[PDB]
Amino acid sequence: DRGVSTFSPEGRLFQVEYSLEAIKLGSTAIGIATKEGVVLGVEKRATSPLLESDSIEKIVEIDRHIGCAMSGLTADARSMIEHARTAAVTHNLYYDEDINVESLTQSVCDLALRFGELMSRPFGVALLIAGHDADDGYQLFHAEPSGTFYRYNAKAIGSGSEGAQAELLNEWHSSLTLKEAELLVLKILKQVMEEKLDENNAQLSCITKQDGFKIYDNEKTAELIKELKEKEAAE
Amino acid sequence: GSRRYDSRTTIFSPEGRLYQVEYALESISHAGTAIGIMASDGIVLAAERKVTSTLLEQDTSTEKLYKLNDKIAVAVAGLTADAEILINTARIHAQNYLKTYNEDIPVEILVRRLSDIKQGYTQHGGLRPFGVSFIYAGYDDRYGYQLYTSNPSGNYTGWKAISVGANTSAAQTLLQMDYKDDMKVDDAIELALKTLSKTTDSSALTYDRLEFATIRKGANDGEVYQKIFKPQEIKDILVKTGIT
Amino acid sequence: MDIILGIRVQDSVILASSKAVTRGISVLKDSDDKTRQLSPHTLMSFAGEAGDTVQFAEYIQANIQLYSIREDYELSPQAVSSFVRQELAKSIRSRRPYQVNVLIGGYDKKKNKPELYQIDYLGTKVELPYGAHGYSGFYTFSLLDHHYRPDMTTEEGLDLLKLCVQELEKRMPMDFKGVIVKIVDKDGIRQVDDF
Amino acid sequence: GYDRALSIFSPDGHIFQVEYALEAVKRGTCAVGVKGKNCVVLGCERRSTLKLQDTRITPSKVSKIDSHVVLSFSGLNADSRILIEKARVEAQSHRLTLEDPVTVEYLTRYVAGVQQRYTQSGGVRPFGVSTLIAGFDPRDDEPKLYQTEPSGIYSSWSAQTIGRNSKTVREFLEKNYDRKEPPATVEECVKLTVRSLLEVVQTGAKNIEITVVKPDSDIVALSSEEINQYVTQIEQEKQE
Amino acid sequence: MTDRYSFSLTTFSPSGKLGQIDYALTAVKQGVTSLGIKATNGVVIATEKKSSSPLAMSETLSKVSLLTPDIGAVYSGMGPDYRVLVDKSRKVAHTSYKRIYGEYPPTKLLVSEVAKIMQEATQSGGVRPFGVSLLIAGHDEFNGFSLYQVDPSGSYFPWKATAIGKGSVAAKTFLEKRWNDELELEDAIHIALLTLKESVEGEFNGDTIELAIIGDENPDLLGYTGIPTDKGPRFRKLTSQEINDRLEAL
Amino acid sequence: TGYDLSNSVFSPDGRNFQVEYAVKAVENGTTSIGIKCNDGVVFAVEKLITSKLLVPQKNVKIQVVDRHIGCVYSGLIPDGRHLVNRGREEAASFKKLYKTPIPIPAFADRLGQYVQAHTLYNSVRPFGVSTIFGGVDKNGAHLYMLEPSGSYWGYKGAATGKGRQSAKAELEKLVDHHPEGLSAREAVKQAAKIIYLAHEDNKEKDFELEISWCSLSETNGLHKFVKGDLLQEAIDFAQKEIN
Amino acid sequence: TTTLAFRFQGGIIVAVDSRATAGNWVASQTVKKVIEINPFLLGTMAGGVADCQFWETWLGSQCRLHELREKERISVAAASKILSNLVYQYKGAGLSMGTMICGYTRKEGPTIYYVDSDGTRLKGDIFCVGSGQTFAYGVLDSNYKWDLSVEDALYLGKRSILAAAHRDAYSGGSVNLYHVTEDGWIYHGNHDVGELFWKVKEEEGSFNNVIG
Amino acid sequence: NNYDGDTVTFSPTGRLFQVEYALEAIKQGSVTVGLRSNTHAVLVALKRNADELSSYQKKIIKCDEHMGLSLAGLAPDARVLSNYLRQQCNYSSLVFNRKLAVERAGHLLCDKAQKNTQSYGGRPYGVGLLIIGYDKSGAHLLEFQPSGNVTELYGTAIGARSQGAKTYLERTLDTFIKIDGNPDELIKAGVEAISQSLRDESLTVDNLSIAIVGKDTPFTIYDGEAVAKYI
Numbered sequence A: 001d002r003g004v005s006t007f008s009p010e011g012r013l014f015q016v017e018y019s020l021e022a023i024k025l026g027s028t029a030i031g032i033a034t035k036e037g038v039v040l041g042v043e044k045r046a047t048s049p050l051l052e053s054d055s056i057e058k059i060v061e062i063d064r065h066i067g068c069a070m071s072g073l074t075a076d077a078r079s080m081i082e083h084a085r086t087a088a089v090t091h092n093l094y095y096d097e098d099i100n101v102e103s104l105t106q107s108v109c110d111l112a113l114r115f116g117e118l119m120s121r122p123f124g125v126a127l128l129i130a131g132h133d134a135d136d137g138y139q140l141f142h143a144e145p146s147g148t149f150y151r152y153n154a155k156a157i158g159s160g161s162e163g164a165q166a167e168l169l170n171e172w173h174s175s176l177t178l179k180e181a182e183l184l185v186l187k188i189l190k191q192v193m194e195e196k197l198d199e200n201n202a203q204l205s206c207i208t209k210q211d212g213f214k215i216y217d218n219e220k221t222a223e224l225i226k227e228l229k230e231k232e233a234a235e
Numbered sequence B: 001g002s003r004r005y006d007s008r009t010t011i012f013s014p015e016g017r018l019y020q021v022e023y024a025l026e027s028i029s030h031a032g033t034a035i036g037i038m039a040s041d042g043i044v045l046a047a048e049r050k051v052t053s054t055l056l057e058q059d060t061s062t063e064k065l066y067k068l069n070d071k072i073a074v075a076v077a078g079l080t081a082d083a084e085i086l087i088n089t090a091r092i093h094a095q096n097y098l099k100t101y102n103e104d105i106p107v108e109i110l111v112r113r114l115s116d117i118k119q120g121y122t123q124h125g126g127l128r129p130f131g132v133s134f135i136y137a138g139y140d141d142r143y144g145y146q147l148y149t150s151n152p153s154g155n156y157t158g159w160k161a162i163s164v165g166a167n168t169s170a171a172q173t174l175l176q177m178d179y180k181d182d183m184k185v186d187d188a189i190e191l192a193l194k195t196l197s198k199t200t201d202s203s204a205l206t207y208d209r210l211e212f213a214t215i216r217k218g219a220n221d222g223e224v225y226q227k228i229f230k231p232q233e234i235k236d237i238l239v240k241t242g243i244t
Numbered sequence C: 001m002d003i004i005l006g007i008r009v010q011d012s013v014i015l016a017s018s019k020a021v022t023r024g025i026s027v028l029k030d031s032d033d034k035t036r037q038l039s040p041h042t043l044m045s046f047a048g049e050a051g052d053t054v055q056f057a058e059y060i061q062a063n064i065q066l067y068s069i070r071e072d073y074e075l076s077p078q079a080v081s082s083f084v085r086q087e088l089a090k091s092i093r094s095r096r097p098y099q100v101n102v103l104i105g106g107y108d109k110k111k112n113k114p115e116l117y118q119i120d121y122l123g124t125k126v127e128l129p130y131g132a133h134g135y136s137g138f139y140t141f142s143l144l145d146h147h148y149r150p151d152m153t154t155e156e157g158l159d160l161l162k163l164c165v166q167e168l169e170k171r172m173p174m175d176f177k178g179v180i181v182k183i184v185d186k187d188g189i190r191q192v193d194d195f
Numbered sequence D: 001g002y003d004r005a006l007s008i009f010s011p012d013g014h015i016f017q018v019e020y021a022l023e024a025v026k027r028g029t030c031a032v033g034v035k036g037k038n039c040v041v042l043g044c045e046r047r048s049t050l051k052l053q054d055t056r057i058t059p060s061k062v063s064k065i066d067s068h069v070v071l072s073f074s075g076l077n078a079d080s081r082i083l084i085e086k087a088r089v090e091a092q093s094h095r096l097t098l099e100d101p102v103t104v105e106y107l108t109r110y111v112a113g114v115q116q117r118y119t120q121s122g123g124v125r126p127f128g129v130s131t132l133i134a135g136f137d138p139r140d141d142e143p144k145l146y147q148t149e150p151s152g153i154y155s156s157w158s159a160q161t162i163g164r165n166s167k168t169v170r171e172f173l174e175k176n177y178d179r180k181e182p183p184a185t186v187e188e189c190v191k192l193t194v195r196s197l198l199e200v201v202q203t204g205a206k207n208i209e210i211t212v213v214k215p216d217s218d219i220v221a222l223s224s225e226e227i228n229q230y231v232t233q234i235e236q237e238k239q240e
Numbered sequence E: 001m002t003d004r005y006s007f008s009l010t011t012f013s014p015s016g017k018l019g020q021i022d023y024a025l026t027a028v029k030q031g032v033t034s035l036g037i038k039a040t041n042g043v044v045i046a047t048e049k050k051s052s053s054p055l056a057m058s059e060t061l062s063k064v065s066l067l068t069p070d071i072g073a074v075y076s077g078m079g080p081d082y083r084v085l086v087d088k089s090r091k092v093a094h095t096s097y098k099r100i101y102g103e104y105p106p107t108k109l110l111v112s113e114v115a116k117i118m119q120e121a122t123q124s125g126g127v128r129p130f131g132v133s134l135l136i137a138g139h140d141e142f143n144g145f146s147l148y149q150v151d152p153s154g155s156y157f158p159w160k161a162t163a164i165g166k167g168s169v170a171a172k173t174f175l176e177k178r179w180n181d182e183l184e185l186e187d188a189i190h191i192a193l194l195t196l197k198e199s200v201e202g203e204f205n206g207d208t209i210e211l212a213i214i215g216d217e218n219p220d221l222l223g224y225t226g227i228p229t230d231k232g233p234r235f236r237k238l239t240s241q242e243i244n245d246r247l248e249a250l
Numbered sequence F: 001t002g003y004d005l006s007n008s009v010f011s012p013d014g015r016n017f018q019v020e021y022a023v024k025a026v027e028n029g030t031t032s033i034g035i036k037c038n039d040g041v042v043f044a045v046e047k048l049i050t051s052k053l054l055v056p057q058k059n060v061k062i063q064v065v066d067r068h069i070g071c072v073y074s075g076l077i078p079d080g081r082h083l084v085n086r087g088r089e090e091a092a093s094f095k096k097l098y099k100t101p102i103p104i105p106a107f108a109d110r111l112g113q114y115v116q117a118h119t120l121y122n123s124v125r126p127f128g129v130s131t132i133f134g135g136v137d138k139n140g141a142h143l144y145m146l147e148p149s150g151s152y153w154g155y156k157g158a159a160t161g162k163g164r165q166s167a168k169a170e171l172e173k174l175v176d177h178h179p180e181g182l183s184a185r186e187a188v189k190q191a192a193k194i195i196y197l198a199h200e201d202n203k204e205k206d207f208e209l210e211i212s213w214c215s216l217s218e219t220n221g222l223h224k225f226v227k228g229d230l231l232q233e234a235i236d237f238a239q240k241e242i243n
Numbered sequence G: 001t002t003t004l005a006f007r008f009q010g011g012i013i014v015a016v017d018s019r020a021t022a023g024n025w026v027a028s029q030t031v032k033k034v035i036e037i038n039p040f041l042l043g044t045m046a047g048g049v050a051d052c053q054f055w056e057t058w059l060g061s062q063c064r065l066h067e068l069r070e071k072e073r074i075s076v077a078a079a080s081k082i083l084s085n086l087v088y089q090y091k092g093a094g095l096s097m098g099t100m101i102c103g104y105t106r107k108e109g110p111t112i113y114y115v116d117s118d119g120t121r122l123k124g125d126i127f128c129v130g131s132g133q134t135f136a137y138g139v140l141d142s143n144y145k146w147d148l149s150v151e152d153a154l155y156l157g158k159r160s161i162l163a164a165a166h167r168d169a170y171s172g173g174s175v176n177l178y179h180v181t182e183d184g185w186i187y188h189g190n191h192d193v194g195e196l197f198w199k200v201k202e203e204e205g206s207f208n209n210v211i212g
Numbered sequence H: 001n002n003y004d005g006d007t008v009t010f011s012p013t014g015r016l017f018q019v020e021y022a023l024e025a026i027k028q029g030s031v032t033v034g035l036r037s038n039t040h041a042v043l044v045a046l047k048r049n050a051d052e053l054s055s056y057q058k059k060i061i062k063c064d065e066h067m068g069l070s071l072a073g074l075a076p077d078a079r080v081l082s083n084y085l086r087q088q089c090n091y092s093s094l095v096f097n098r099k100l101a102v103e104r105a106g107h108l109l110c111d112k113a114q115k116n117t118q119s120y121g122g123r124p125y126g127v128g129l130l131i132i133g134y135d136k137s138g139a140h141l142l143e144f145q146p147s148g149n150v151t152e153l154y155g156t157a158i159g160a161r162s163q164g165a166k167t168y169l170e171r172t173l174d175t176f177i178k179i180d181g182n183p184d185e186l187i188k189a190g191v192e193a194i195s196q197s198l199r200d201e202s203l204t205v206d207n208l209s210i211a212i213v214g215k216d217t218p219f220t221i222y223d224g225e226a227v228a229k230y231i
């Protein structure tokens, strides 16, 4: 065989590159940032109809001012979320304040490359981390198993990512309202999903300065789906 | 580094099997047959020694049947050295329980712990598994007389009658044929010997190639006795059933 | 903590334990239950150092409950008492020992007999027809030596117990705020509400 | 200490050791879980190539984790004991610190977390086991049924099956189970569970085990004759 | 740095063989012949002294070794592996028995400890099995005289008489014809010398042969007097002269 | 085969191919020399000027150990630095326990044993440097050369790198023509000449000279660098000889 | 310190003083001895300031982590036991704490737990903790009924701290009041003993031992 | 081929392929330039994005008031190495009340990278670094390679198409070395230098990244509208 922390002749780490392929097989997750807030949405993708879809938990709270969505080998994300929640609460204990979104993301990404022959392999899951703070305002971050993180105005990850990203390139502008961003996530999710989009197989969430991080109900999302269909038929 | 020479003893095959456990079972199938039969008033343990030499000391010998405590014994099939490592651990475990609770260890609890040790060697550590299968014969005041088996996988099951080692397929068919629930010990003694006599790879079954033991309540009033048979006692019981 | 008593009669074991919890010059509580059910037919009362008592009792409770689930079987009172003794015997040579004295009352369902064990913080175990920890014994033992018989009923045992509490309330220096009484028999564990 | 990374990614983005652990689950005996209006039922297959067995002492397929939660499985039997032991210890630890028994979701999350840890730790292989975990939360009457698998993912199910020929019995349950109206009674819930196993088993003699769990720590295992009556009734209605 | 070999070097093959143990037994087959015979009042163990060079002093190299005053050992196979096993065997007799019970262990239990050490080299990380088979003779009060063989796997068997190494097949057959249950110790020494002449090719005298017995107690070899219960070692190594005396009436 | 894939494995010849492969990395490096003299030792080294952008005199390659030992090396520069860091720890623990500064032969074996230790396991790589080193102690002057295998000897003169053969030939002539001995100041001059003559084997990029010395009379038994007037005087002597 | 909390018909009243001392030196008159753990949980502080302040703050962080992990507010029982298990680990090391964990949840209702540095943990309806606990008990016990109104209960809590503030040399400064209901805790102001004593003396006619 | 499985293995010609493969990761990275005069030392860096919706990856990192670096290659490795430098600079200040020499900073980075090339299990660092600083011996510029080699220079560049800027600085050597007491002119020369490595893309306001340190100037970084002056 071969070492776990080996470089390829092109100068890339084999295991990190292979973990990126696992993330491409994962279910779609989309995030959009506005001046009124940040929206996070995901495809649930139940493997069978007998599975109770509401138990599928791919959107997660880290703190009141920071939320998180995931895609790939979702079981690997549990220890990442556990670390994030501890990091956020620990900083509040040491400094009597909220922790910056960027500083939280950096703390999670420090775990990434702690593998070799530390854990036995990289994480096989990517994360969209959304939040707000007083200094840099509303923010969206894409955290990879390479240990790298980029800030984004909008970003998609998972199987329908390259198609959804191209659509986000055209649709995003700096004046988007929160409502406009909610509909836009639903629209793009409906496009890249296999099965027909409804309130049971897709889930929305958002983070605002005033109310903090909130996962939407199935009743609330269902109305936004109905509002979306009506507007597309209106021209 | 040393990665080059690692056999990876604790991995799955593409079919979802454990290579080393399967190969350890293949090893055990060439070992001398051992039979355990459970009657209403006792338990029999019978085992065949591996191709004997005439200059072997037979009376002061122990290969197949071992005593774990006063109420529990085991029959061995596989590598003897590996078995003794496990037997000493089981003996210690029994004494820990007695020290802690002031009661003799229940049979299943002893069996489970020994089987859990075997399981560990198949999931972590990178070491080869123990090439040993046990038949456990014992008594306690909860379930009475009990027969169990364990194998390198660390999986264990309970039985009325069972064989391990060589020719188990043929031996299990014969036991399934003649066994019934209201059976006595003396009948079970006869069944055990008759089954070995028909499944053996030797020309004829003799006293010097056997190990035998019973666990009866044949002591005086409500107590269990372990009898490990002497050579002359095996010679007599073989004549008494008309095999020689 | 202070007063814990135990009496074994024909068909049951009766435990009586004081209700007071006192710190400094203040009685902080007068309804404290100084006991834990270890299994359906086994009960343990306790007394000693603050904090240690409950921590130890609950630790034993958790271990016996774990055993019950694992084996789907109830350990005998003798077996439980031996486990508890060993834990205290380990403790006495630790960096910081458990300063807790206990009584274990149980009904053995296999033998159909009640059993009472007295164990101190050193790990000193004895089976007894009647037992006590602390200063209580200096009054109750002589009293029970006189009035106790081995063939007594549960009702007779409760009257015998009333006689002990009355004596303690007369001659003990501290106000221990009465006792909670519990009975252990073939049908399990129950509490006497009016004592 | 033995350090080797046994669970690793491949070029196509798969972890073969985790996927091969799923094959071990596929080899295991079938296990099914169905939840009704006021109960959950766990059914389990037992292979009949083993006669001369002693059923008194042989390890049962369904295990109590606490007085209100049960766990069944499919896959390597020895591996399952390790998960069951860890779960039982955590159950008692939760009661000790939180002064309340575990929820079914919490217990599942713990067992699933253990399985995940064995997929990215050095010197260990994944568990060759998938589990069905069922019960009722403390002071609650809503039935709970969860599933776990070697990778570590877990989820809730109205009804679910695992093990060999599980795709056949899942097919049966998908058309026979109505979300709008689940099995109203205990009898209806057991019958549907037995029916689903009869699609795969062979004979309805000493091959099927049934365990019923009701609210407030009310768990009981059915005997041979009790199960056989369900088998006799179903076959007579079939001939039509 | 550090021992990265934490995994087993002996594993099961598809056919069920343990390769390294088989290969270790092959090394024992190549080794020089050694034997052991049990009499009514004693035990004898013998082997050829294969010299590496005539300039080498074969007296300095001892193939027959004292383990306790009443237990001795000989081998066939790899010499260096044997030497370190003798060191470990001598030590374990003290640490796991004499320092606990105040007396030397019985033969069967000392053998059981040596067998354990050899079994661990079959399963532990980063080691090969021992390339030797041992013959261990000994006496103790409650079992009397006894002879044991120990193989690379860690298995051990009790024998009336046996041989191991180069010409063990022929030597075992020779011992079957001559062995009975009424043999005196001197008769067993005579048969030991006859059996060994068949496997030896070159010179056959007291200088090329190494032989030791487990017999009566030797007060003269004790080194002190005054304690009645201490009567001396039962292990004795026969001298070069003592062997030649028995080769004349052969 | 496959005997060359792992360190500490003997080939059927009895050779350790991984060490021989490390020697190839030394042969690829720049030239460095050592000259033993009347009452001390001199060290010199070739520094290739890759670009105009290199700061002259500010990429120092010769290293001091303690206050009386000098070390130069050819091959993988980082590996050499690791060896010197160990050397400095070895010398420090000697002086701590025994008071006196570490003797040169004592120091030589400390490095030797450490390098040799990296040929004993497959979990480490051999060193990719040959090290010329020495100094003055109670018994006088000593010059040593140490190789990837762990082998070292004493030397009258020593050389290693890409131009080792040219430097060896020139060193042999000095030993023959000066049987009674060579002075410290002369040995500095000669060291310059030999580096310049050895530069003919690396003449694409022009180079920078760097010398150091230890002498009982000239430097009072301590290790110093040659700079300024004495350095330029040695450069001019070398320039006159090539033409 | 003097701190108290009692259970009654309309929930829980919690009252504390605000003095800090180093021997006979009055170090502060304005110390906060109640800690707001969440909208439904309160913690009281007696003993060492650093010990109480540090660990009860640590407790709040552990409670926040519970509701993030379990998607549910922590019980008063579980919250109090985290603290009691923590201090038990330090038993003998010299921590000095007398605390009360007070709050409401659905499953428990209004609940009070006493927790101290030698590991004692007690559920109860009434507790007074601190150097002036006995002075508070004297007034509180003699006037307590379950059927007290919210208005009367608030006053009794206030009046009991005032009693201890007056007689205990190591208690004083001001009174801080809290009321805990099914909807959460409500703050009922800071009350300086400088003004409150005379106001109570005049209106109530009590404190006749003092020169008017 | 057969000798590139790990860092502990030499090739038949004496090469360490895993170290060479790490060197390759630097070549793929975005360009970054370094140069100095006698009074000041400057870093210029071209930042890279994922797409138009993403941010630009930050290339420059501060180590102390008087020292910092720019990166090219694996960014997480630069974070580990810079953190080590931050600790070493800090150890010098707390224990000796001494600002760490830039030359010693290099020696410490070399020795840390080397240990990862001689042991089994580990891997080389996959990043190159340009370290600038002002200490007691004036301004300094260092180039770090993960092979362990550290070099002090007047000017240099690393990353993709870094040969263009390296050639320019080789021509401009005599000019920019004498830019003393004039920060803006030394930056202008650095901006003109990095421009020789551009293809199809030009320097924009959220693309460029500059950093400076000197005699009466602490290590500071300029981004955004603060670099509009130099376009």
Ligand SMILES: *[C@@](C)(CO)[C@](*)(O)[C@H](CC(C)C)NC(=O)[C@H](Cc1ccccc1)NC(=O)[C@H](CC(C)C)NC(=O)[C@H](CCc1ccccc1)NC(=O)CN1CCOCC1
Binding pocket: G001, G002, G019, G020, G021, G022, G023, G025, G027, G031, G033, G045, G046, G047, G048, G049, G050, G052, G096, G130, G131, G170, G171
């Ligand atoms: C009532 C008021 C009396 O107990 C309350 O119980 C309050 C509790 C509230 C404020 C939480 N308790 C105190 O005010 C408490 C009493 C006390 C003192 C010392 C040990 C235990 C309990 N006071 C303190 O904790 C004071 C706080 C103020 C700010 C000074 N702190 C000290 O006395 C400190 C630290 C004590 C200490 C604890 C453990 C290890 C070491 C030290 N000590 C000093 O500041 C030293 N001293 C002050 C006088 O000037 C010389 C230096």
